[PDB]
Design a binder for this molecule. Structure first.
Ligand SMILES: O=C[C@H](O)[C@@H](O)[C@H](O)[C@H](O)COP(=O)(O)O
Ligand SMILES: O=C[C@H](O)[C@@H](O)[C@H](O)[C@H](O)COP(=O)(O)O
Ligand SMILES: [Cl-]
Lengths: 566, 558
């Protein structure tokens, strides 16, 4: 429009009209009835040859509805978008960039991927080799701190995409048998917030002489990160009594901005770079995640994580639409959000290891698809990206599941694993602790689908006064994803699965999943407030500070703040 | 009921008027903004000017609260009436923090405060003795680690308060050398994580469960007991010195092997999600930080309680916050609220509020069982600022509208100011706190974008519609007292919304179905592990989907 990548807007697509009718048909049918159809149920399961099992039977779809959804994906040219992504076309059109997180995990010997005439895999693997060598030396003690001590602590400084994914993976692997051994004696703190309390927390229990600082920022100008980096710098200067020469041995960086890293005093043999075609929220498989993960766990664990994400990439670019797990989860979510109007998705990993997975998926989803215009700048007449949130199970069952069962409908995504990282089976116990865990994983989706009717409650002998309070309407959709175990490889697969599903949804809608213009205004306005606060702290009057140009509310609360802080 | 109130009709018309107007125009009105601020004498500053209301609308909101008898309900709550009618229970979390010498509050002819203060005195003495070493582990070592076992209401509030206090100057000194792990999930990885780095001989276990029958918590307690038995070479006699409990079920605590001098009880009228000011929270907080810190926390909750009980409707912060939320959710249809504290100390505050709000008001019937004609409780989520700005604010600014609640503090627990630096690190943090609400309210039009040289190509992409609402709350500092005030503010705001809607904020029947069905799957799994075939295990009665995925699971874990 003209030359747009997928010109049939969602409402123009042939299957859109058809899918609106399906919605009218399917809203009359309860999940408890649809699930009586085993032939249907059976054809809404997919199971890959590398261990990914997905069940999407608890969705308001017939096989007919699914066929319309697949047709819609074709009409929106989603398979063609996948090829453009993989061949390195600049599909991030508002920033004129490629979108090549997938290149980060293509193995050496893969088919070249060209961006402006250069095969980007050459630089991808050159950085991976350097991380491998560097992580090996730090871990062995070949590289030491300024006073000759082994570096056994890491402060990884970074916000948003520069830590959420990494912290997800870090915690996912912490209790893994092999990873734990390799991390033995080693610690990593994530310094994210500009709140100086987070600086204090990152420093706690760390001797600077045994500590390595990793400064992680794409631009190397992010306000919080650079402030944190200078503050940690100052902590070293206090420790080393002002001797600047002591700093170089304790600092390294991950960025796309080598002028920035140099000006900060970190030389290129301590910078492990990445590229503009790696979005922050898609950066964990670049040096952003691979360096800190390699430092904590060794390069081998980090490599297996990359191989798993690659496995899921190959699936995404080669599986037929109807067998393609990311396409499928993308279609189901667009169906729930756009056609059924459900604004939220609950991300529910039945794994304490995945404590911070929902937090990473929240950025990945919301920052990608929380948009209001198409790639080509047309205003959408409808809300697009869902609100994602979550906590691991069973925890969440005692927090917000009350609402998911009896309140607002929230489509749920249950994620589980067949084997435990740290199995327990007590002799007196009927079941292993993992089986107890998983009894919940299997029971919750059926509870959401089937519910419990007043009729059943009466037969159970519930008094009539309490029947409405104990009614479970059901009809609440869910997907169940189940992997063999929490290995680096399956963590990579799960990551890549969600990375691609987010892409699929963005392409279904015609938006740009890969820019984030929505964060700019806050940054600009906060810089203005910074200036005002500086002037007041310097002793300038309100008429002198610039605050008089702000609205009356902000005027008054600033003044309260200055008065309470002076 | 709600729709029958005179002010409901009036508020339906206000909504039609207000959706045609933009906050950028409303906020030009300084007299208006000025009346949309409250500031208490214990330091809580609330600004709700960035809301789609005029002073007329607000009057209508205040009237709706009277029409729904929100003030009479407060009085019923505080006097110990059984206002949780589906369970026939009083709702007396405010009793937990009434100071010694407060007027009696009766349930079933008994002044509940006698029991409230008796447990508090026993926690003070017990915590003093553990912390000083007058009470030791079985081998005589000072106890310096706590494994607090508990799920849901039995830990989320406690972990919120714990992390909020961790970096406080005085609390940190009191916590120095002391560690606490929260064992919540039945996932045995959480057991391994709880036990990690703790020598059992220096570790105290607090088992926390209102019923003392929750599946996860009891299995956890049994698993930790086993860990103790293996350390101590099967010697039962060693366990007593390492265990204590918080529960309403003393038959269950005894039967577990914990005697009454190591049980610190609470009561049926304390909801789980309102329990952190009972023994649930007060014992582990007192253990970690010493009792004085726990008491100051209680005193802060109590200050806000008195405010809730006495402030006139229009000056009453919980009522105001609850009214504004219903305005957004019920009248404007916004289903979510973002809870956004500009404080790393409040890392787990959103997670606690998520339970408090959603488990309370995620309901579909009124107190007396009438089906509601509309959705009620909002979906709450959040992360601290500034973290969240680099995670999901993109959507809050340009995507779906999500009413936001910004929480900040005037002073830092760990102030840094660098010589080379224009502002202190806290001021940098706070620059964002002050900027974001105005970014949301005013936005940035295409016209302004053109004036700044943005090419016409990018103008749509860089447009911010604005008109997105927010509240700003500012306290003096992250002290135990202000943490208490913040907690009680939210407990009461949730209660306000419940009463406006006509629901029971205080039951949670919604969790039973998953528990009953999980117990059945447990039995099927046992039978499969024991070698019963698929047709012999009970599996045959489940839907096909579950039968298949269960068999996959057994195959893959055989
Ligand atoms: O997708 C990422 C977004 O652009 C942004 O939210 C980013 O993740 C963080 O701000 C970190 O930015 P730097 O890596 O540039 O510091
Ligand atoms: O308000 C809380 C709810 O009742 C529920 O979330 C409860 O908090 C947990 O299920 C733990 O209950 P116990 O304390 O009985 O283990
Ligand atoms: Cl996904």
């Amino acid at each position: 429009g003209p030359g747009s990548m997928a010109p049939t807007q969602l409402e123009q697509c042939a299957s859109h009209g058809k899918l609106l009718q399906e919605k009218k048909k399917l809203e009359k049918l309860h999940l408890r009835d649809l699930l009586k159809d085993e032939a249907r149920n059976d054809l809404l399961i997919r199971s890959t040859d590398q261990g990914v099992y997905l069940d999407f039977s608890r969705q308001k779809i017939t096989l007919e509805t699914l066929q319309h959804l697949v047709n819609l994906a074709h009409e929106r040219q989603v398979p063609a978008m996948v090829k453009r992504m993989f061949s390195g076309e600049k599909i991030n059109q508002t920033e004129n960039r490629a979108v090549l997180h997938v290149a980060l995990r293509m193995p050496e010997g893969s088919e070249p991927v060209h961006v402006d005439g250069k095969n980007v895999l050459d630089e991808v693997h050159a950085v991976l080799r350097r991380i491998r060598v560097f992580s090996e030396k730090v871990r062995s003690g070949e590289i030491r701190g300024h006073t000759g001590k082994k570096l056994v602590n890491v402060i990884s400084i970074g916000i948003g995409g520069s830590y959420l994914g990494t912290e997800f993976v870090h915690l996912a692997l912490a209790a893994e048998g092999y990873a734990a051994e390799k991390a033995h004696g080693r610690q990593i703190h994530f310094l994210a917030n500009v709140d100086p309390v987070d600086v204090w927390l990152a420093e706690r229990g760390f001797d600077p002489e045994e500590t390595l600082v990793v400064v992680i920022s794409k631009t190397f100008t992010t306000a919080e990160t650079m402030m944190n980096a200078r503050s940690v710098r100052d902590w070293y200067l206090h420790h080393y009594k002002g001797d600047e020469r002591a700093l170089g041995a304790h600092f390294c960086a991950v960025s796309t901005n080598l002028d920035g890293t140099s000006k900060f005093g970190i030389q290129s043999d301590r910078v492990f770079g990445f590229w503009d075609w790696v979005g922050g929220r898609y950066s964990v498989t670049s040096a952003v995640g691979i360096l800190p993960l390699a430092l904590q766990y060794g390069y081998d664990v980090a490599q297996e994580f990359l191989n798993g994400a690659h496995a899921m990439d190959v699936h995404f670019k080669t599986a037929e639409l109807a067998d393609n797990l990311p396409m499928l989860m993308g279609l189901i979510s667009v169906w729930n959000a756009t056609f059924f109007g459900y604004s939220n998705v609950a991300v529910l990993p039945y794994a304490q290891a995945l404590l911070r997975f929902p937090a990473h998926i929240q950025q990945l989803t919301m920052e990608s698809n929380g948009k209001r215009v198409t790639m080509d700048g047309k205003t959408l007449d409808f809300d697009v990206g869902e609100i994602f949130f979550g906590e691991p199970g069973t925890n969440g069952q005692h927090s917000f599941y009350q609402l998911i069962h009896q309140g607002r409908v929230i489509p749920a995504e249950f994620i589980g694993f067949c084997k435990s990282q740290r199995a327990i089976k007590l002799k007196e116990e009927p079941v292993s602790n993992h089986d107890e865990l998983m009894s919940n994983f299997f029971a919750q989706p059926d509870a959401l689908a089937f519910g419990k009717t007043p009729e059943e409650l009466r037969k159970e002998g519930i008094p009539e006064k309490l029947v409405p309070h104990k009614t479970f309407p059901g009809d609440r959709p869910s997907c169940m994803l189940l992997f063999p175990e929490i290995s680096p490889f399956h963590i990579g697969q799960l990551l890549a699965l969600y990375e691609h599903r987010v892409a699929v949804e963005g392409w279904l809608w015609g938006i740009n999943s890969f820019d984030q213009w929505g964060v700019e205004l806050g940054k600009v306005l906060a810089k203005g407030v910074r200036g005002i606060l500086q002037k007041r702290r310097e002793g300038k009057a309100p008429h002198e500070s610039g605050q008089s140009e702000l609205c009356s509310s902000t005027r008054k609360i600033l003044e309260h703040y200055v008065q309470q802080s002076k």
